Structures are given as C-alpha cells and as structure tokens.
Amino acid sequence: SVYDAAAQLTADVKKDLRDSWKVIGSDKKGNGVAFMTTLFADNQETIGYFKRLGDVSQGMANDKLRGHSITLMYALQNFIDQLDNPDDLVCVVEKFAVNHITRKISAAEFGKINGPIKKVLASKNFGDKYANAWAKLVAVVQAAL
Amino acid sequence: SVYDAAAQLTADVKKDLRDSWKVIGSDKKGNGVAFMTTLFADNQETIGYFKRLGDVSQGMANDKLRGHSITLMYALQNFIDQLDNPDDLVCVVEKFAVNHITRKISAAEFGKINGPIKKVLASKNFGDKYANAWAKLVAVVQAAL
Ligand code: HEM
Ligand code: HEM
C-alpha cells in the first residue's frame, strides 16, 4: 500500500519537492515553527495531541515547541533524501509511522497538515503546483497510518 | 544537567564533530547500519529493546532495521546542525530524550553507543581525538535521560 502511494511520486513531483525544499529546508526552525503554529491556528483541535508542549501560544519562544518543530523538519529532510529509492523511502516512512500509530493519529487527522504546508509554501511564493506535490508526499505517510 | 553538559562542547570539540560528520554523514544508510550492527554484536543485551525490528542479524536486508538506522542518522544530523546555538541544541536534545526515557533507556545504557561510534570512526581513519569529541556530544544526551 505504501509502495503504491510512493508510485504517485513522479519525476516532476519529485523535482518540485526538491526545489521547494531547497528553500523551505534552509530555515528549519523558522518554517518548522510556522507549520506548527499554522496547524494550531487553523485546526485548534489538534492541540489536544500536544499537551506535553505546554503553552503553545508562546510560539517560537516555547522551548519544547521549538524543539519539536525543528525535529519535525528532519523527518521531511529524511523523506526528501530518499526520493530516488522507493525501497528506502518506504522503510523510512513505515519507521516514521510507528509512533504516530501508537498515538492513535489517523490518516485523516494527519492530513490536516496539508493546509499549513500550503500556506507556508505560499508565503515563500511556491504556488498550487508545489502544494499538490507535497500533498502527494503526505499521502505516502497517510498510506502507512 | 543538560545545560551544564552542553557547555562542555568547546570550540575544538564542535570543529572535530563537524569535520568527522562531513565524512560519516556522507553515507547515512551504510554508517547508520554499521552503528547498529556493531552495537548488537558488542552488546547483545541491547537487542531486547529492539524486538520490533525482528531478525537484526540480517543487517541491511532487514527493512525495519534499515529504516531505523537511516532515521537514527538524521537525529545526529539535527544535533550537528544545532551546534551554533546552545539554546536550540538543548531543546532538541530534550525533545529527543522523551521517547528514550519512555522506553526506560538509562544514561548508562545509551552510553553503550560510544563503542560502536569509535569503531566506525576508526574504520574511516578518525582516531581517539574524534571518538572523544563524539563521546562529549553523547554525554549531552545522557544528561537528559
Ligand atoms: C508532515 C508532518 C509531520 C511530521 C514531519 C512529523 C514529525 C514528527 C517527528 C519527527 C516527531 C518526533 C519523533 C516521534 O516521536 O515520532 C513527531 C512527534 C509527534 N507528532 Fe508528528 N509529525 C507530523 C505531523 C503530525 C500531526 C499532524 C500530528 C497530530 C495531529 C502529530 C503528532 C505528533 C505528536 C503528538 C508527537 C509528540 C510530540 C511531543 O510530545 O514531543 N504529528 N512528529
Ligand atoms: C547515537 C545514539 C542514538 C540515536 C541518534 C538514536 C536515535 C533514535 C531515533 C531518531 C529514533 C526514532 C524516534 C523515536 O522513536 O524516538 C530512535 C528509536 C529507538 N531508539 Fe534510539 N537512538 C540512539 C541510541 C539508542 C540506544 C543506545 C538504544 C537502546 C539500547 C536506543 C533504543 C531505541 C529504540 C528501542 C527505538 C525504537 C526502535 C523501533 O521500534 O523502531 N536508541 N532512536
């Protein structure tokens, strides 16, 4: 199933992912926090999963949230680096899913990250074309949940 | 404390970490798997913590082990990237510690990774000077467990 989702990552899709990541990944702390604070603002209900982070309204200044946000970006870095080898992408995606499955995060719940990603990409001037590419990457993860 | 341990990362220690990582981080899959197989060989008692991975003697052929090994390298990449800012290094280290604390991995247990790191580093022509540099980085994580 994960392999089938990975099949949607065509040559053009992988190219758009790498080009956008070249910019997005250049500031992991800034964009990582941007992803999270946008998620919490557009889908307040997701905050229920992050009680451990404490006062998330503090944003960047919250050490726990900042730590989580930076770390989140290295999972994407991992995914992006394995794009040319389906076997490695799949094993890393399934490895990543383990803890999220334990947390009872469904594919539908995980999909809520698409909105924030689209908004952050747009703030960097990466249009719908790029948003659709990232949605496909997220779909690979969703297939493992 | 983790804040006191982070201060132990002096100028030259950070420099040796970067120079060695430039080579070691070049092949995350190969070196990551080497780290793990060496750990399981020198400390068979730690295999119990990785029951989910299955037959760990299969090495590279074991998809779950390969997935974990590659992922492990991105945590180190994270640490190396935060060396410039002690505040970020600390929040990233504490974030990383959460799941290991939940698994009841003690500071002493975590320290068993020092052997494997020294051996892989030696196989790449990086001697004691570098092994000790990495031990100091590992000590920062140990302080958070
Ligand atoms: C593309 C998006 C995402 C990425 C790359 C990502 C990445 C990560 C990473 C690397 C970790 C640390 C390792 C672990 O514990 O598994 C993590 C932890 C976690 N993730 Fe995900 N995640 C994403 C989306 C989500 C979403 C949408 C939710 C919830 C609706 C979620 C909830 C969690 C929680 C609760 C933790 C633990 C936080 C803590 O207490 O420190 N993740 N995630
Ligand atoms: C250089 C040291 C190490 C690094 C960088 C590292 C990194 C990681 C990462 C990134 C994960 C995935 C995220 C998570 O679930 O927390 C993880 C999982 C894990 N780590 Fe650590 N780790 C290290 C050493 C150890 C040691 C020494 C043990 C115990 C003897 C250990 C036991 C575990 C276990 C059991 C898992 C879950 C494996 C699975 O079911 O997939 N780790 N570690």
DSSP A56-122: GGGGGG-HHHHHHHHHHHHHHHHHHHTTT-HHHHHHHHHHHHHHHHHTT--HHHHGGGHHHHHHHHH
User: A84-95: b or e for each residue (b if 16 or more CB lie within 10 Å)?
Assistant: eeeebbbbbbbb
CB of residue A107 inside a 6 A radius of ligand 1: no
**CATH no. for residue A141?**
1.10.490.10
What does the block give as tokens for A73? Answer: 């970006």
CB contact under 8 A, B67 and A99: no
What 3-state DSSP class applies to B54?
A: coil
A35 closest CA partner among A132, A118, A138: A118
Residue A14 to residue A1: CA distance in whole angstroms: 19
* C-alpha A75 chain-centroid distance: 8
- Range of the structural domain that residue B64 is part of: 1-145
As a residue count, chain B comes to 145
What are the Cα distances from residue B119, in Å, to A10, A123, B16, B38, B68?
Answer: 40, 46, 16, 8, 20
With 0-12 CB in 10 A as exposed, 13-18 as middle and 19+ as buried, what is A43? middle
Chain A residues in contact with B96 (beta carbon < 8 A)? 71
Q: Are B126 and B20 in contact (CB under 8 A)?
A: yes
Please check whether residue B76 is in contact with residue B140, taking contact to mean a CB–CB distance below 8 angstroms. no
Going by C-alpha positions, the residue among B116, B141, B122 that lies closest to residue B41 is: B116
**CA angle, corner A113, sides to A122 and B73, nearest 5?**
100
Tell me how far apart the alpha carbons of residues B137 and B43 are, in angstroms, rounded to a whole number: 21
Side-chain-facing half-sphere of B1: CA atoms under 13 Å: 4
Nearest-neighbour CA in chain B from A62: distance (Å): 9
Diameter of chain A measured on Cα atoms: 42
Would the CB of B102 count as within 6 Å of ligand 2? no
Asked whether the beta carbons of B130 and B20 are under 8 A apart, the reply is: yes
| Cα B19 from Cα B129, distance rounded (Å) | 12
Helix residue spans in B8-85 (DSSP H): 11-24, 28-42, 63-81
Annotated binding site of A for heme b: 100
Min distance A32 CA to chain B CA atoms (Å): 13
How far is Cα B37 from Cα B62, in angstroms, rounded to an integer? 11
Tell me the angle at which helices B128-142 and B11-24 cross, rounded to the nearest 10 degrees.
Answer: 100
Question: How close is the Cα of A130 to the center of ligand 2, in Å?
Answer: 33
Indicate if ligand 1 lies below 6 Å from the C-beta of A99: yes
Asked if residues A36 and A120 have their Cβ atoms less than 8 Å apart, the reply is: no
Q: Are A9 and A16 in contact (CB under 8 A)?
A: no
* Distance from Cα B121 to the centre of ligand 1, integer Å: 31
Flag whether residue A26 sits within 8 Å of chain B, measured between CB atoms: no
Displacement of CA B13 from its chain's centroid (Å): 16
Q: Domains in chain B: how many in total?
A: 1
Angstrom distances, CA of residue A138 to CA of A23, A60, B50, B67: 18, 24, 27, 18
Q: How far is the CA of B72 from the centre of ligand 2 (A)?
A: 7
The residue of chain A with its CA nearest to that of B70 is: A92
Sign for the pseudo-dihedral over CA of A39, A43, A44, A49: negative
Helix A11-24 crosses helix A128-144 at what angle (to 10 degrees)? 100
CB A96 within 8 A of CB A72: no
Amino acid at B87: D
d(CA A67, CA A28): 11
Candidates B29, B74, B82; nearest CB to A77: B74
Q: Is A39 left (phi over 0), alpha (psi -120 to 50) or beta?
A: alpha
Resolution, given in Å to one decimal, reads 1.9
Instruction: Give helix A63-81 / helix A86-102 axis angle, nearest 10°.
Output: 150
Distance CA A91, CA A23 (A): 26
A110 lines ligand 1 (CB under 6 A): yes
